RNA sequence: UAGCAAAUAUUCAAAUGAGAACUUUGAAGACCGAAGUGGAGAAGGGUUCCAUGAGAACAGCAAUUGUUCAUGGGUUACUCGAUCCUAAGACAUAGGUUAACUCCUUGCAAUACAAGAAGACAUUCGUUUUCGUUGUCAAAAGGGAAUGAGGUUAAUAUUCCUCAAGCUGGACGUGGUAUAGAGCGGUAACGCAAAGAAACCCGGAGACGUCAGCAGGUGUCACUGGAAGAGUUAUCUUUUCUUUUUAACAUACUAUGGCCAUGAAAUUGGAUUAUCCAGAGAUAUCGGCUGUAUGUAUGGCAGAGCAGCUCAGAGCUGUCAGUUGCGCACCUGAUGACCCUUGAAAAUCUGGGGGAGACAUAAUUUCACGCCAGUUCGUACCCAUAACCGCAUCAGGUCUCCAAGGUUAGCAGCCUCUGGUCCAUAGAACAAUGUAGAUAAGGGAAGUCGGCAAAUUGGAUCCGUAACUUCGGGAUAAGGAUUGGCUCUGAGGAUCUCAGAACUGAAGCGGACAAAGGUAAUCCGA
């Protein structure tokens, strides 16, 4: 499992059978890409990055929420 | 503090074996556990590693020594005399080879 | 009608079989290269180590092979004073220095030597023991004979062309420190064929040994046994010319001279 | 124990099968004297040879 | 107090058989098999025995898994020798050839 | 009839059954007391494992019960082990010996020797090229490519399920490094996803003893505030117990040492508990580089696990923040001491020196991301006061790992928590004799071949301590005192030891446990 700090690489990865898993925690939110040998997590604190990334969900990738 | 009068390192043997035997031994033991001056780096760091084998920790040289000593008197003697005989060999042959010119 | 220990030492399946697992290599000389007969080859002491059965240290010597790219490692006998990383010279022209190897005929009378050769190209025979040296007595004019004086002190005539190491075998003196404990004796003999401990032939019953007498513990038969004594017969001091300790009439060694 | 050869496994299997009781319907045959299987064996009282 | 169980069918305590106690998300204390430590990489010259810098100390296998970096250094003998030995080598070679030529001209 | 008496223990109610001291649930009382009567292995056993059922026999009383009988069912692996490697060793082949059988040699490989391997084109041969003396077996603790947590079965699981990883061998795809010869930065240690190659020669790891102390980490144990639950509540107790967890693996940082600068040290300094280091360059710089995590943070990850509370399978709440230890077990790091001891090897992974060849529409390259595969065998269960060996369900014997609290020098003994267990035929009487356990007024070996047996002594602190001697010793010599409780006082340290004083008891206090009786001679053997 790898995690990503900078949204850019994350977006290069979800731009590269693709599905995206978003999960809510009290203080934080996480976005999760499945790829052959790695599970990519992306965490953010503030709601701005949050909504912005929710926007970022493309038609190619389907969004699952737990 | 002076901890022993006669015995020294021999005290490990405690009361065993008889005096004279561990006299002989006091001698030898103190020989083998002594630090020696290294010919090469000139430190007195040379210690014995194995029976015939001595090392200088700092300069990393290993030399073939005697059993309880670094330097065996009869070996020093053989060096001294090897040299002296070198001198005589060369002086002789080299000198009388001038007689061969006749 | 039992078999003494005396006899049991020649069995090769037996219990007395050397413990060889520690042996590093045989300690011998270089092969007899052309280089050695007509010139000199030089090598390094990569190290001088301890072989578990040996009193004398062994020298590990790098040589460059004359005929190929390979680097040749060899194990020589430590000449006292040899240093790790030393240059060692072997051959005809090699000069006289501690640990170099020349023919004896080139070594000056009165010089001290190691690891001499009985037949030319032994890769060594005489004076290999720790601290041992052989003494150079004389040369024939021809150059083909040399009188050596062996550690035992017997004089021997060796073809002069034979290989010798200048100097004395290393690690001398060990024989002088008394061994106090039995355990020491034990570990020591652990690395060689077992000689230890030694049970006196009298302790044993007549079945285990000619000696063990019986009710008293004596030999009861002359313990000087003749050279031709059969396998199980040969027990005491064999073929002995003298027996006792010479005290008092020691002037005889001198007056008899 | 745990560790076994094939050979072993197979042999053990064999003796395991051979250790069944005479099937209750064999005793009803016309030509048989056999009430029971005389060759049955119990691991505790008798041991096999496998090494 | 939690107690453990070997997981390997080797119950004997051998340098290769070592175990470490790990605490799981389950709340269990589980034996996990710990690997063996290896000796650091030393310069190969005679009597030198220096610890090489900038090379990874890794169990022999993982050496196929690492990046070229850890396998090496940038000197003339990067992997095999330390700087001191390199240096002394350079110097020695140069000066030795110098003496060689000198002997050559003195012969001619 | 002898006899069924070692290993402290059982008791009550219900249920089931023809029948219960001996089965199942519950309620009590005790034991093993983490050197276990606990949790798992190796050897050995081989189905003894699981479920259902049960007449006889067997389970030396009994049985509704079973290690017994009958019937069915259980042992899933790229990452565990075998398989590979080498060892002590051993055996072929070749050669030799024998009437013959047999026997002798062989890794430092031969008492042998016209014995091999590789490459390429060919792709069969053949052709061709290169280098070459010649085998195999022996380790389920040695070496040894990579996996973890959670969940599941009546019985298997690092194997199955779910989720998350790594390894080796394939084969291309897409991006990207490098070159008209073959990365770039730093003075230097060295650095950075990547940066051409054959023969050949050398390396590193693998790869290693025993002991002693120091330092750190993991696990455990202890303590602190918060929250949920539980025990106690006549009295007292802001109480007593419980949960409060984080796998392999990914990225970044720190980590006992070693290096590189700059500068050189005498009124020598530096430094460890100990050693030890320095002009062969110490100490010291807002200096720098590098190596090892069973460390920290984040990812994994909370969605799992754990603890509570609801609803009639769905639901909700919390799982938080600290401190210390010469504590303990293990591991690691830096050392030290020791040897007439000096502590495997090979397979395997990898690096260096060298630059013969190969190649323009080209050639070759230890970067990413994607595609494919991982075969064969062992995986049940016992490992013992009932699954082994002792003709047995025998008080014997049989190789390992994990270990809690209190007292304490202590892994001793004694008592406890987790987990396990009460199984050893039972009832009643209470004579002699016995087996084991204790205590005897006055005397004190008079007993007896003999102080046999018993008794005395015993910890710690303070006193005091001979002859003899190989000067090490003798030595706890001999001997003399003290020891509880309670209330105070002082001293040693960081950003738990030691000593004083006073008071108080049937003058008791190492209160159990634990724990030497001395002395003087003679003989042997050091
Ligand atoms: Mg995967
Ligand atoms: Mg004194
Ligand atoms: Mg044989
Ligand atoms: Mg002597
Ligand atoms: Mg006889
Ligand atoms: Mg008699
Ligand atoms: Mg006598
Ligand atoms: Mg006698
Ligand atoms: Mg078995
Ligand atoms: Mg049996
Ligand atoms: Mg039997
Ligand atoms: Mg009886
Ligand atoms: Mg029991
Ligand atoms: Mg058990
Ligand atoms: Mg069990
Ligand atoms: Mg062998
Ligand atoms: Mg053989
Ligand atoms: Mg492995
Ligand atoms: Mg799996
Ligand atoms: Mg691959
Ligand atoms: Mg060591
Ligand atoms: Mg609390
Ligand atoms: Mg540092
Ligand atoms: Mg939850
Ligand atoms: Mg500690
Ligand atoms: Mg232990
Ligand atoms: Mg060593
Ligand atoms: Mg290169
Ligand atoms: Mg038994
Ligand atoms: Mg009774
Ligand atoms: Mg009395
Ligand atoms: Mg009296
Ligand atoms: Mg009295
Ligand atoms: Mg007595
Ligand atoms: Mg004293
Ligand atoms: Mg006293
Ligand atoms: Mg006395
Ligand atoms: Mg008091
Ligand atoms: Mg006081
Ligand atoms: Mg008082
Ligand atoms: Mg008392
Ligand atoms: Mg007495
Ligand atoms: Mg005695
Ligand atoms: Zn030196
Ligand atoms: Zn070096």
Swiss-Prot record, chain A:
Keyword Transmembrane in annotation: no
Residue ranges that the Swiss-Prot or TrEMBL entry lists as coiled coil: none
Keyword set includes Ribosomal protein: yes
Record-level GO BP terms: protein-RNA complex assembly; translation
GO cellular component: cytosolic large ribosomal subunit
Superkingdom in the source lineage: Eukaryota
Gene Ontology molecular-function annotations: structural constituent of ribosome
InterPro entries: Ribosomal_eL38, Ribosomal_eL38_sf
Record keywords, A-Z: Ribonucleoprotein, Ribosomal protein
Entry's family note: Belongs to the eukaryotic ribosomal protein eL38 family.
Protein name: Large ribosomal subunit protein eL38
Species assigned in the record: Tetrahymena thermophila (strain SB210)
Gene it is expressed from: RPL38
Curated annotation (Swiss-Prot), chain B:
Keyword DNA-binding: no
Pfam families attached to this UniProt entry: Ribosomal_L37ae
Keyword Protein biosynthesis: no
An example Gene Ontology biological process: translation
GO cellular component, one term: ribosome
Molecular function terms from GO: structural constituent of ribosome
Residues in coiled coil: none
Superkingdom of the source species: Eukaryota
Keywords of the record: Ribonucleoprotein, Ribosomal protein
Similarity-based family: Belongs to the eukaryotic ribosomal protein eL43 family.
PANTHER family: 60S RIBOSOMAL PROTEIN L37A (PTHR48129), LARGE RIBOSOMAL SUBUNIT PROTEIN EL43 (PTHR48129:SF1)
HAMAP family named among the record's database cross-references: Ribosomal_eL43 (MF_00327)
The name this protein goes by in its record: Large ribosomal subunit protein eL43
Swiss-Prot record, chain C:
Keyword check for Coiled coil: no
Domain of life: Eukaryota
GO molecular function, one term: rRNA binding
InterPro entries membership: NA-bd_OB-fold (IPR012340), Rib_uL2_dom2 (IPR014722), Ribosomal_uL2 (IPR002171), Ribosomal_uL2_arc_euk (IPR023672), Ribosomal_uL2_C (IPR022669), Ribosomal_uL2_CS (IPR022671), Ribosomal_uL2_dom3 (IPR014726), Ribosomal_uL2_RNA-bd_dom (IPR022666)
Record bears the keyword RNA-binding: yes
Pfam families xrefs: Ribosomal_L2 (PF00181), Ribosomal_L2_C (PF03947)
Subcellular location: Cytoplasm
Gene Ontology BP, a term: cytoplasmic translation
Keywords carried by this UniProt record: Cytoplasm, Ribonucleoprotein, Ribosomal protein, RNA-binding, rRNA-binding
Major subcellular location class: cytoplasm
A GO CC term attached to the entry: cytosolic large ribosomal subunit
SUPFAM superfamilies reported in the protein's UniProt record: Nucleic acid-binding proteins, Translation proteins SH3-like domain
Family: Belongs to the universal ribosomal protein uL2 family.
Protein name: Large ribosomal subunit protein uL2
UniProtKB/Swiss-Prot annotation, chain E:
The UniProt record lists the keyword Ribonucleoprotein: yes
GO CC annotations on file: ribonucleoprotein complex; ribosome
Keyword Ribosomal protein carried by entry: yes
Keywords recorded for this protein, A-Z: Ribonucleoprotein, Ribosomal protein
Top-rank taxon: Eukaryota
Record's signal peptide: none
UniProt xrefs under Gene3D superfamilies: 6.20.340.10, 6.20.370.70
One record GO biological process: translation
Gene Ontology molecular function: any one: structural constituent of ribosome
Pfam families found in the cross-reference section: Ribosomal_L34e
InterPro entries cross-referenced by the UniProt entry: Ribosomal_eL34 (IPR008195), Ribosomal_eL34_C_sf (IPR038562), Ribosomal_eL34_CS (IPR018065)
Homology family: Belongs to the eukaryotic ribosomal protein eL34 family.
UniProt-listed PANTHER family: 60S RIBOSOMAL PROTEIN L34
Protein name, as recorded: Large ribosomal subunit protein eL34
Naturally occurring in which organism (per UniProt): Tetrahymena thermophila (strain SB210)
Lineage: Eukaryota, Sar, Alveolata, Ciliophora, Intramacronucleata
Gene name of the record: RPL34
